[PDB]
Design a protein around this ligand. Structure first.
Ligand SMILES: [Mn+2]
Ligand SMILES: [Mn+2]
Ligand SMILES: [Mn+2]
Ligand SMILES: [Mn+2]
Lengths: 198, 198, 198, 198
């Protein structure tokens, strides 16, 4: 049974970068719905699987990927942010960024571009390519999860669905991108990165 | 050269169903952006086409469909709404609705379902299948335009991108859908339908 | 579990419309591989579901849809053909074909077009739309199954993957489509169609 | 106006790795049809563009990408092969492969996996990522061209559509992949790679 995880901070902890109304709706409504729907879908898949009903398993894929992915994505997203975040990472993660993108600032331009480049709903990601052994930027549509659809280990995700920023920045997604850099929990991203050094 | 058409009414003409801030942003920003992006992309295609640069033509497709589609969809959308709208259509359109969907209410349930069913950004459409000579409902992702991607002639469209309802209804897309029926310009939908019968 | 069904005829029973080597490979190798891969994938999904591993479920979707779809599609296809086939259906099925497509010949022109119109691998289908209560022609990419991805009930399928015809007709898919009508099992298609009106 | 490029060798020049029947059909029929379809589509697109018909432009995208990509892909493919090729590439290309994939053998395994991994019709590619300045392996569906859809510069392509191997290898695609390494034109692959060093 999946559950809506608790945020590591209060709804207004990311102000003024991401306002309180967005955090509350995003978490209590959007993420919550993904969780509730995911549980129903999984139960239905178990029933279809037990019956060897292939058509039913196939028909359930859209809801499983969408809500299952949404659960994966938002859960990671909350840990990627912090009221004590911002600045730049340090140590091995910082060195990997320089090595793979030239500089931290160049990395920001790249992740920003991937995030701004999404037409429609989606996510921008900084990931780790296990076979190439280096960092890699990628964009995902709707709620398609990074690992489940590309194989890359997610380290940092940026939600660019309109509900992630509209109330505060309206149509100007770029302003939202410039703002979010102020609340990134580089400690969490670093931990996720080191988990790859397994 | 494509141009941003003026709305058929003022920004606040659709209150309280779709508020003034939504109408103004939707038209002055989202649609406005599609129009220029479309014109720039077409001029770019003209140059690639002239040079027989196939890679260039292919790389421009996402922008052309997204903004070209954005222009087509929103242009139809404004005409589909009216401060004097609402109610039910009459004549041949209504009879086709009864014939193809059973009743006006059943049709409403079906278009609402298709619209509510869009995962991510998209549109819900009531269209006309010229091949079969009857009505047909369909959903399109992002800005993919109905006729250009399915062959169906657009009669009535419902924008379900979060920017079309979020500032007012937040995450409750179903409440937006319920509200929009109050401003449907059935005169315009009937016109588009009869034109398929020219 | 799932197992490879036996053909309702010998591998060379559809000559000279579809030669023996194609029937043999298509059934004993292609469909066979789909079954074996399906069983393995279902087992993997059962494990991922039990552990609540959503990423694993997502990652397995491509293999599940492709091989599960492959098993579904080929199983129907074998029953849709017969050495004692060809001609035209009768009774209610023919009645619906005339009503929904104008005539049997127009129907053939339409399904033929949808089949030849597949760019890449896929299938052409004559299905039944339960909601609208009438026939509907649709095309599906790769092994995506008709009902699982469109909701339409499959009645007659035309495999347009190159392995369904290349050994005999090479690149000329139209020649293959022209020939297959000589072996369509209208008894089976009528049976499927009657099962829908229940 | 686009034209079918002559092969750099005779149809039976790649025996016994890729027989003469496949080479003749692949070039004179498959590639040839893409060229014709491309010219016809480009012309129709020019007509639509001139009249500002956005719907017409969108409707033509599938045929343009499919046949334009087809022309791009096969044109590169022909130059990627040679009766005097095979073995390992000489010069910097090999050092780059060692750097980015560990060794030549590892490189072959990955490109083979990416090629065998295509479900349905498609291509396997060894490309060059200009932004990251290193080699990168990717797979593309149907005829979607590498540079046009991913931005990666094509260096070596492996056609895995069934028409590229079925007449000779039937369903055993892995045997086709094994055999193709014997005719790789590393001179051309290096030529394409050096053009990326700029
Ligand atoms: Mn979100
Ligand atoms: Mn909109
Ligand atoms: Mn098949
Ligand atoms: Mn080919």
């Amino acid at each position: 049974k999946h559950s809506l995880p608790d945020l590591p901070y209060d709804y207004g902890a990311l102000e003024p970068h991401i306002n309180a109304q967005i955090m509350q709706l995003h978490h209590s409504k959007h993420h919550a719905a993904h969780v509730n729907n995911l549980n129903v879908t999984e139960e239905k898949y178990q029933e279809a699987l037990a019956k060897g009903d292939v058509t039913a398993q196939i028909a359930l894929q859209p809801a499983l990927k969408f809500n299952g992915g949404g659960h994966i994505n938002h859960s990671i997203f909350w840990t990627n942010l912090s009221p004590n975040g911002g600045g730049e990472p340090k140590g091995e993660l910082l060195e990997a960024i320089k090595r793979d993108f030239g500089s931290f600032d160049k990395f920001k331009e790249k992740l920003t571009a991937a995030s701004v480049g999404v037409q429609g709903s989606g996510w921008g990601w900084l990931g780790f390519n296990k076979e190439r052994g280096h960092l890699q930027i990628a964009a995902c549509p709707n709620q398609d999860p990074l690992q489940g659809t590309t194989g890359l280990i997610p380290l940092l995700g940026i939600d660019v669905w309109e509900h992630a920023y509209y109330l505060q920045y309206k149509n100007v997604r770029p302003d939202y991108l410039k703002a979010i850099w102020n609340v990134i929990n580089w400690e969490n991203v670093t931990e996720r990165y080191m988990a790859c050094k397994k």
